[PDB]
Design a binder for this molecule. Structure first.
Ligand SMILES: [Ca+2]
Lengths: 228, 228
């Protein structure tokens, strides 16, 4: 059939970071395990991660795969809509994390017309951090294009994880910038050296964070990995 | 059948630069046309380019393809062995280019112990120049791995092309660095605004040139496109 198969085509390692929309036929298992990594072994027992993975797969979502469209995602970003999922298990969880979250939802979001995205972002720890700017730009475009009129979310709820080095460092280096612009930031006590961290950002702050995150490599990736 | 085909897999453009060994079953036509571009319309009538492309396909050669292993190379680098091909049409051509190349060949032949690569390097003008450091590193490894003992060629004869701006500029930005380290470098008179340029480098000068050429992006490519 294909005379280039089994004919020296793998002599050179070629690791490519290809971006795909969330695929409900392929991505569920790997997404569920990335959520387990994000929330950690204790909080994973407190969230229905199967339900959250299903929600993600019906939401604006971008994955990164190095082993083809058929393979597992090694990184994803998803913007889950708060108001449309206001009765979801994950919203139920977030309402109980801290009064700052429940107060924000009630007073800033339920109060009026402002829209809130629940950000789910995780990747295997060997994934390069320079994929993050193109990842956010593509997924933000998914929202803006579907909403039309260059609209966007007003606020973003980001859950992430940090660690004690014996000093605290970041699994996701972009969180350094998110923290700089966060309207609200708080963290749980460390457990097994890992800290659960919660940030509320407005859209201006999110965009500023991604701009400040840009490197020569992430700009290169944006030029080669983008919507039509 | 592949259920991920015709299922949203092209929503995001993903341009990747994959590196392959020279493929005699696929690459001949494109290599010959890249040789025509390299030598130009006048000198192409003075070289048997079919014979040269055949020599390239039997030599250490790396190509870059964006459209898969079955597609045409858009960039290649080849090190053709001088001594093994010392009666070839291409050596005959180089001997008559200029007394400065003929004198170098004589000094080499008479030495009896030095090895020289005939470097053939060309790419479509839309290819990004940052691919050049990983392209050279992979092809040099082809030589060193085959020979063992970290051995390498002593000298490299590079034919290239430059152009008159109406000032002289480079089709291959790496030539600016090669020129600074060249054992011998001379150029023919411009024809139709295009200048034929001839460089002889020793291995130390070639290594220094590639190191000077490295950028954040070319180093990124090296980390993701390399031998096993
Ligand atoms: Ca790349």
């Amino acid at each position: 059939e294909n005379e280039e198969e089994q004919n020296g085509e793998e002599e050179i390692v070629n690791i490519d970071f290809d971006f795909f929309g969330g695929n409900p036929e392929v991505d569920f298992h790997a997404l569920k395990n990335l959520l387990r990594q994000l929330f950690g072994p204790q909080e994973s027992t407190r969230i229905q991660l199967s339900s959250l993975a299903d929600l993600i797969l019906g939401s604006p979502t971008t994955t990164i795969k190095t082993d083809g469209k058929e393979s597992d995602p090694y990184c994803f970003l998803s913007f889950v809509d708060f108001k449309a999922n206001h009765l979801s298990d994950y919203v139920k969880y977030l309402q109980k994390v801290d009064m700052r979250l429940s107060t924000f939802f009630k007073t800033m979001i339920d109060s009026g017309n402002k829209n809130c995205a629940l950000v789910l972002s995780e990747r295997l720890i060997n994934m390069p951090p320079e994929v993050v700017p193109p990842l956010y730009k593509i997924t933000l475009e998914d929202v803006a294009t579907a909403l039309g009129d260059d609209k966007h979310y007003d606020f973003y709820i980001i859950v992430t994880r940090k660690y004690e080095v014996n000093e605290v460092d970041y699994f996701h280096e972009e969180d350094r910038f998110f923290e700089k612009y966060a309207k609200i930031h708080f963290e749980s006590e460390a457990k097994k050296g890992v800290i659960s961290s919660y940030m509320i950002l407005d859209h201006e702050g999110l965009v500023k964070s991604i701009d400040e995150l840009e490197t020569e490599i992430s700009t290169w990736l944006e030029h080669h990995h983008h919507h039509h």
